[model samples]
Target: PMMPPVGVQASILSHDTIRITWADNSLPTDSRYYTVRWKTNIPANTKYKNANATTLSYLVTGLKPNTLYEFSVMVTKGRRSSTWSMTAHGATFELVPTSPPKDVTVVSKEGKPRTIIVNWQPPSEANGKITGYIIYYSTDVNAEIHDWVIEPVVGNRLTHQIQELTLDTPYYFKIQARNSKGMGPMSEAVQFRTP
Candidate 1:
């Protein structure tokens, strides 16, 4: 029996599927059906789906979005499934985040004087994991100029405090979201008066 499917290719399809295909290196008289298996971790005993595909390809659905899943397909006989094929790694497609950060507000402290705090809610349409953020601030009216904050935060947090500023001066602030894909659109500029 043709045991393994070779030259296998797996690719991300929708937000929750991976399409797999292979070349049929089998004699014309045999090798008819296949068994498909996919999981987050490889296991000696994993669940599978039976397929009778002459297209030499199969589409698997109901997978987690933007998550990595490994797959394998093997030739099968009546009640006997052959050895599993070589593993093909694939990740589900992720939707790009379109909505910008919301409720952008700045609070000042009277007790600390010259210290300010910024807060905002994470994007409601975060289509993927939000790794960190970028903050831009300036004293001038033009937000494009001055003091761009760089450095990835360890986790998803919405608040930042800035201190040691010239009290009574007006400062403007903005934020941007970043993920594995790239930088998302920036939020609207918010103005703040330091204590």
Candidate 2:
């Protein structure tokens, strides 16, 4: 008697779920039920198990974000068993959260021309949802006027230019993000001297 051949393919979907589809590729066999199992970390005994119709696919939900899972499929008919197909791995989908930008540093200071360039990373902590940047500056550490300039930056910008200052003046700078949730907390202030 021929046995049912089992095969499985797993994938991670956008909604943070894992989808597993299996097929019985053997000549029409007498297997009346299919068993599926999955586990995290090592491919130990599947911590999850389920039975499905011959034409049904399984949707594993409530999976932890950023985790990898292993799965296998087996089909049984009465007292006989088919070989367990190869184990497959699937990653859980995760929505990248908005991370606070990074590398918030000052660069391109022209000491003789009285100009400075400021740049920063778009909060690596912010998965990738940064909209724009709000740059702040002041001349006096105790100055009450916290003048700010809003610059609309795309996803890939980390630098800005501030020009036309007195030949020799000291300045302080800071930056933040403006997304759908309004302005983020201000970054640490940095000081620079322009020639």
Candidate 3:
């Protein structure tokens, strides 16, 4: 008979990796391996050899981003396996969107010289759920987004309005998708001039 593993800790290592550790309180000569099991929506298992009875941790990778996983461990020797230890949990980190919004277009309102309307489609590769969109504007063509003024729009929307601008001035505009993981890269800049 084997004593179940105790004092287990499960922690996130990255967007797709987790580390599981536990106390080695079982008889040194009786255990030959550690079995780790985890599940989010489905169950999976892996085995790690006891390092001369000193091994106490295992790293699991290739997991989905922004997911919570429940984990358990057990000790095994020969053909016998101990009862699974108490359950532990870990959550993977979320990822910033890999792509910016698509079809971004900006146009000045026909009757309003200082007002403009911006439209865009959501990102193609939104690694996490989009929380909102960010509109960046700059008077200088090819200016970095860090130097641009920002207008944050909360929640999902296909169209947004920008008000108050200098007449006859050329402005560059771009869009970025934002999620819990943070903002993604800016989209291609669209230039519009006030009439």
lDDT of each: 0.73, 0.64, 0.83
**Which parts of model 1 are misplaced by more than 4 Å?**
1-91, 143-152
TM-score comparison, 1 vs 3, better candidate: 3
Candidate 3, residues 32-61, lDDT tens digits: the string is 788888788343553322222336888888
Query: Please, what's the RMSD in Å of model 3?
Result: 5.6
lDDT tens string, model 2, 1-195? 325435678878853578888777654435456666677865555467554545536777766555678777766667766665568789775444334456677664655365678888766444234667767677775666434434445544688777675656677777777554455566677877765
Off by over 4 Å in 3: 1-4, 13-17, 24-31, 41-54, 62-65, 94-97, 102-115, 119-132, 138-149, 154-159, 164-172, 178-182, 190-195
TM-score of each: 0.54, 0.46, 0.59
Backbone clashes in model 3: 0
Task: Report the number of clashing residue pairs per model.
Answer: 0, 10, 0
Top lDDT prediction, candidate number: 3
Candidate 2 vs candidate 3: which has greater TM-score? 3
Query: Which clashing pairs does model 2 show?
Result: 97-127, 98-126, 99-125, 99-126, 99-127, 100-123, 101-122, 101-123, 102-121, 102-123
Lowest lDDT sum, 10 consecutive residues, model 3, at: 45-54
Q: How does model 3 score by TM-score? A: 0.59
| Quality of model 1 by C-alpha lDDT | 0.73
Please identify which of the two predictions, 1 or 3, would achieve the higher lDDT against the true structure. 3
Report residue 192 deviation for candidate 1 (angstroms).
Answer: 0.9
